[PDB]
């Protein structure tokens, strides 16, 4: 959000002749913001299109630098705490799964829009159960995989 601007002469408006003498369909690509139009947009000043210059040396030294780590790949993340995390998450599926049963019978009723609005105050096991499953599978797949990868890299 920049939208660089410039002033228009008061003589032109007094003369009434439109400024900027458009000679290409390049400036009329961005719809002026209504908030900006309320003020002196196209009345006391005119916007100028703004673009950016990017090069690989700049990009590769920013994109391939921002979120990176050196050696965290081969770290087993507190093996004692890992299974404890699993127990807490899995135990949540025991109660979450039970509520799933109670959330299947009462569904598939008339006016599903009524059913759709009926899920605006209470947790929906359909989505909550999936969220836990997603984290569970990735955490162990990564955690387990590092176990065999390390067992060959180091002796």
């Amino acid at each position: 959000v920049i939208d660089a601007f410039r002033l228009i002469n008061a003589n032109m408006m007094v003369l009434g002749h439109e400024p900027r003498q458009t000679t290409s369909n390049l400036g009329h690509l961005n719809k002026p913001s209504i908030q900006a139009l309320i003020h002196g947009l196209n009345r006391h000043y005119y916007s100028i299109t703004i673009n950016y210059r990017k090069n690989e040396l700049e990009q590769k030294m920013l994109l391939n630098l921002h979120k990176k780590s050196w050696m965290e790949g081969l770290t087993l993340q507190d093996y004692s705490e890992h299974c404890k995390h699993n127990e807490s998450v899995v135990k949540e599926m025991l109660e979450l799964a039970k509520n799933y049963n109670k959330a299947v019978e009462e569904e598939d009723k008339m006016t599903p829009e009524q059913l759709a609005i009926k899920n605006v105050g209470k947790q929906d096991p359909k989505r909550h159960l999936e969220e836990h499953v997603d984290v569970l599978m990735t955490s162990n797949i990564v955690q387990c995989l590092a176990a065999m990868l390390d067992t060959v890299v180091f002796k």
């Binding site: 599978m137 797949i141 387990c144 065999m148 990868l149 067992t151 060959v152």
Partner: protein, 116 residues
């Protein structure tokens, strides 16, 4: 009888043939029996004197076992035959399992993210 270990019956049937002597085939079975019997006894058992294995099948005191022992193992000692089987040094390793396991889990990752 051959499918199970019951072999004392095989020699009993070897002397009872319906068609004829059929010896042109019984000779073939000898190769398929003695080789199997020796293999079974090859396990981690203890010493067996040259008195059971000698008078067991059909023969009293031949020299066949002497040749039999020669082509098999059964180191000769003070009337002492050994059959040692450890199969313990090879097991108890995961480095080789490490490569197999790594491929396995990656497939779980492969078939869990990319669209088929």
């Amino acid at each position: 009888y051959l499918m199970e270990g019951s072999y004392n019956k095989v020699f009993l049937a070897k002397g009872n043939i319906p068609a004829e002597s059929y010896t042109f085939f019984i000779d073939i079975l000898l190769d398929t029996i003695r080789d199997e019997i020796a293999g079974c006894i090859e396990k981690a058992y203890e010493k067996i004197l040259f008195t059971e294995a000698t008078r067991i099948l059909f023969f009293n005191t031949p020299k066949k076992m002497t040749d039999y022992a020669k082509k098999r193992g059964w180191v000769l000692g003070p009337n002492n035959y050994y059959s040692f089987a450890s199969q313990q040094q090879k097991p108890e390793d995961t480095t080789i399992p490490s490569t197999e396991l790594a491929k396995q889990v990656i497939e779980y990752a492969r078939q869990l993210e990319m669209i088929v």
